[PDB]
Amino acid sequence: DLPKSVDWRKKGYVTPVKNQKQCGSSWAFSATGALEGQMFRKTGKLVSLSEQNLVDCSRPQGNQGCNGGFMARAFQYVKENGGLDSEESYPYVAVDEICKYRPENSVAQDTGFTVVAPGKEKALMKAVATVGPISVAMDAGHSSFQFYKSGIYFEPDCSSKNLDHGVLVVGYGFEGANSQNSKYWLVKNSWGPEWGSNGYVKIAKDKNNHCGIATAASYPNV
Amino acid sequence: IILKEK
Numbered sequence: 284d285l286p287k288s289v290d291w292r293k294k295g296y297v298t299p300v301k302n303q304k305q306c307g308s309s310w311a312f313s314a315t316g317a318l319e320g321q322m323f324r325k326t327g328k329l330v331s332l333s334e335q336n337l338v339d340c341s342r343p344q345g346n347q348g349c350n351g352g353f354m355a356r357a358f359q360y361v362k363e364n365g366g367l368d369s370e371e372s373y374p375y376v377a378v379d380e381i382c383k384y385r386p387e388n389s390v391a392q393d394t395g396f397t398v399v400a401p402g403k404e405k406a407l408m409k410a411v412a413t414v415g416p417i418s419v420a421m422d423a424g425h426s427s428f429q430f431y432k433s434g435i436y437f438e439p440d441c442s443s444k445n446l447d448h449g450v451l452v453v454g455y456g457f458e459g460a461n462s463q464n465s466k467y468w469l470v471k472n473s474w475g476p477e478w479g480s481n482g483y484v485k486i487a488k489d490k491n492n493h494c495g496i497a498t499a500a501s502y503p504n505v
Numbered sequence: 506i507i508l509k510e511k
Contacts (some may be wrong), residue, residue, distance in 0.1 A: 307510025422510055447508055479511040499506070 285412045287462035288468060290454035295454050296320040296370040296415050298331045300482030302475035304377040305347035310335040311471035313418040313449030314357035314503075318367065320415035320453075322391050330390050331371035340364070340382040347381040353420040354449050356398040358503045365408070367391040393503035401444070404489055407468075407497040408455060416453045416471070419500040423448035431479045435467045436494075437487040443495040452496065455488055468496055 291297055298319050301312055311334035323329045334383040338348045341360040346352030361367050366389030373383060399417065400406045409415050422442045437459070458465035467485035476482040487493045 309510060310508050347507060349511060350509050353507045355506070432509075447510060448509055481511060 285408060288454070289301055289344075290410050290456065291320060291411075291416050292469075295329055297471065298329060299412055300476040301375070301473050302332070303334070304472040305344075306333055306338065306350055306377040306379075307351050308338050308377075308451040309473050310346065310352040310354055311357060311362075313420075313451050314354040314361075315367075315370075315469060316416040316451035317354070317416055317502050318361070318391050318393065322470050325417055325505050331370040332391055333368045333375070334368050335370075335375045335380070336368045336373045336384055339380050340378075340384050341426055349377070354420070355398070355499075355501050358393050358501070359492045360394045361391070361503065362395050365389070370394075387409070391505075393505050396503045397499050399497065399500040399502075401498055402491065402492050402495035404492055404497045407452070407500050410500065410502065411452055411455055411468075414502055416451050417502050419450055419452050419470075419496050420446040420498065421448055421450055421470075421494040422446050423450075423494070431484055433480055435465060435474065435485045435487050435488065438494065440493040443492045443498055446498065447493045450484075452500070453483075470496075472493075487496050
């Protein structure tokens with residue numbers, strides 16, 4: 284059956300917390316996070332990937348650089364493009380720039396991606412437990428989220444359908460000794476390690492898809 | 506589908 288708790292950071296699949304700064308590129312950090320976990324599973328090497336490569340080059344797939352985008356479009360770009368560069372070879376500058384993708388600097392590839400059935404938290408749990416970190420969209424436009432600090436995040440104003448931020452679910456768990464109470468999703472954000480809990484947030488889990496965590500989740504196929 | 510971030 285599925286584990287009671289999962290935390291892929293303890294297994295080497297997750298890079299340190301990054302910062303998107305003033306660019307609306309959360310979608311790009313969510314996509315690189317999921318790709319960093321799948322590459323690690325395939326090769327045993329953790330290599331930080333280029334969000335800038337995605338910001339500058341994926342407009343043909345429908346992304347809008349610093350104005351917005353979507354993780355599934357980023358994985359499509361990776362598929363159609365044949366690769367994705369490392370962060371060290373294509374650094375992040377938080378502004379839309381000229382596409383400078385270099386195939387010789389590619390350290391990741393995908394063949395498309397798999398989507399988790401919309402709105403199904405149990406299906407999201409199955410994906411997290413069997414695959415690795417999963418890219419998800421959520422409604423993050425709340426001052427309570429901006430000022431989040433500890434504990435399980437639960438916000439009555441959250442929507443499960445109007446989403447505006449891409450994040451990465453790296454695990455799940457519960458508080459206490461009963462595995463079925465006070466559950467939460469372990470989510471990595473892209474607002475720097477100074478935001479939230481060392482850059483992470485526990486979002487209420489199994490509470491009717493809180494903030495839309497399971498509404499649009501997906502992962503790359505490597 | 507796109508997340509309007511800015």
